[PDB]
């Protein structure tokens, strides 16, 4: 726990190293803003010192002029550091989103089933911005205090050494209290979390067994047991508030205790020592803050570890990269057009003890047309995903032209292998972007000819801005037929070797596919026809009759 | 509003005692500037010890006493607010259980979890924090504006405040206009982030994942270019808000300086005026931040109030005859479209009833009717010559027993779970005999520390058979007349099914215990006394299995197919 | 918005010897951050539905 949070902090700061220079400028403007603010009492004292004795117009004018200038410069310097610190928050927040988004895309699809859409957003939106807020907020408060404390103690030491040691020696008395108060507080908060957790668990079990509680009918006991847990929980809030109010009293008494004991000697410093008239008023104005700034300094050191636990839940995504095979790229010099499955065993990564597909041994598919017969929930899409290499096979081997699918390149497999799904994948991009989805340099004539071959060209022609028509997110503007025809236009735009069809021809037009799957275009490779069309099943040569995760 | 205030107030007196205690302390809180003024004017003119010390002693006594009055007052406030927090949380929890089952059945858990604990906690937490500070600084404001009279000085300060809070909000509006664009452009990037990832396998199928990161990088750089203007705007706003402070402070030096030159009001009185004016502005500055949060909080409060505002016949002689006189069981959603319709039931003492039929053919509704959770829509459903509503909840709990379909188990120990729902505490011999009779004694004696073993969440430790056996012992421990079981032993073992069947049929207590349950096991029905062939609510036939087999009806078809 | 950083500056500008102190200032960020945590997830679709839909 303690080492983990330290190492995770040491990991956190390392991410900010590219934005070092601006933090040094922010440090310089902060030091300037503090050292400016500490100079405002010094002159204001000297104005009161000079003024009582004589009008002294040049001294009076100059002292006010410089004081008023330094205040203006301090106010300016206090702004620009804020402008730097708020800009620093943009750096880490925009950086972490890019790293998080890029890291998630590399992760396996099995995790996506486990992960919740609401949580993944919540961490991406809030939990990042907390982590980006962390370092500037911690650095600003720490650095502003550190410089101001040693500043004030310096500006005290310039005035006198006699009244400083007694005021300094009291700080251990305050620092010792905060260490007890914080250790008391954090334990009570963690106790309250556990108390509220037990009180909540009763509501969770009650909500879980509503019918049980209503059938037997002893609600009064459930309310009484909830009230019993609420009573002991209520005591923890009372202890916290009583301990805090007591600390307010102790601090309020101790503040004036040091102030009175100081000021009394401060009066003697005029009579006996002959220190200075205005310097007493300055030293008081300095003192007033000195203690109050230590309160932040003692708290921030201990408090630093609390916000680290928030980052851990983001870093949990970044931690692990275990899935998939080694990224080695076999390049297809010529289109082999040979799909195979040697003694395959398809099981889901989400749950190991479930029998999905076992002993899928056949292969030998190249010429003519291939068909994949099977009932509802037989696992035809699982075989298509196994052929396309979405999920890794639990047993056997998915060979392609006497070579492993994992050993194939990802771009080469995406280029060579294809799989026309039933439901059309929609995106926010334009018709050209959707038509050239995952294309490095798609040809304009190729995209238009692919759409014309796919039979969406009449729809694309009438559409506003033609090929640059903005597609509505989740398929808003385009119809079901256009959504299906778009997938045909994608397949035509690819012009890939292998091209499976998972229930695509049922919704879309029948005449469109055959022309693409005949002649020179058909020679790219065979097609795994997984669909309900018996006419397509009759026309095809090969017919894999699947049954109960086994070849009939 | 009126209901909000009327419900929340504690005593007529504890809060009144607190309010009087705050005022008397508040004068002691703001006593310091008068003593500071006296301390300053002493240095300029006077040189007496007694007057100076007397001032410091009164200063110290008032400041120390005020701290004690605050320490007590805050204690009484937090003690009273604790009672209100506990009372409101106690009242709101009961209001859930008071409402009918239709809301629980129709609506999901997430609503009834989040609306109860989180909303009531975060409301009362906000109210406790806000109302404390609201009533504190108002008394400070009124008392300091009071002592400020002891006319021209008050006329000055009244005119200044508006100018203090004019420029920050006026310039801050133009600052805020840019923020909504950053929020929208951020939400846009997150929208595209979720939209791109949501359909993962379509991205994974192709090699688009590399390309999308560039589109993400562009959408981020479009924010990055805008952020430069937002970052400097914060610094510009910081200057305008800060400079107004020096404009105010210098104005006081010039306006006060003329009064010092004229020599009407003294330097000490000027120091008090400056201290009170500086304290007043900083006090009021916090007071303005609550009024939005009250409007934010009260919006939830009215919905919590909207959520909240929605003849015990005793046990003595067990008659044991249930008459569904032309009954009609219908759900709360659809009044006309009933689950059970034209019910003509007629139970009796010492007779195993049965209700054979299809999936959702008034099976659960009939059992729920007999238990009397949801009342009958039409006709009548008397038990022992009297309506179920007439019986006392505890008495009906004792008389009627019903094992549910989903074998639920609480988080407590096996003794607590076995003896759940009872006024008097169950004896160890009773708990042991119930577990022995029901057939859970092997499960109870087999586990660690007997009945003291804590049951895990969602039935983790206990199995399906152990949960069903525990549910059987839970019902058996009461020793009730009516015995219900809708889909109880669905995934029951050979050893379990035989035990439940023996307890149902072979057991001596069955003579004084009616058993009307939706039988999963056919043999349990085949070896019963009374039966009914349900069909969309209405009973088609009602007799013996041999009679139904001989006549050839629903039971014959159900037995055959 | 970067609201949190404004609140710290407001506190560090006017310290005094008040009742709230920096201990509260962090709790305001914890409270407001948890509100954003609640608001973010509830904005789009539904939290119960995972990323991948089909079993």
Numbering used by the authors:
A (entry chain B): 130 to 681
B (entry chain A): 173 to 322, 325 to 484, 492 to 742
C (entry chain X): 1 to 55
Paper's wording?
The transporter associated with antigen processing (TAP) transports these cytosolic peptides into the ER lumen, where a multi-component peptide-loading complex facilitates peptide-binding to nascent MHC-I molecules.
Here we present a 4.0 Å cryo-EM reconstruction of the human TAP/ICP47 complex and describe the specific atomic interactions that allow the viral peptide to bind tightly to TAP and lock it in an inactive state. With this map, we built and refined a model containing the 12 core TM-helices of TAP and the N-terminal 55 residues of ICP47. The last ordered residue of ICP47, P55, interacts with Y477, which normally makes an aromatic stacking interaction with the adenine ring of ATP. In TAP, however, this gating region is cracked open by ICP47 to a width approximately 4 Å in diameter. The presence of ICP47 blocks both openings; otherwise there would be a continuous pathway across the membrane, a state violating the alternating access model. In the TAP/ICP47 complex these residues are buried by ICP47, consistent with data showing that ICP47 precludes peptide binding.
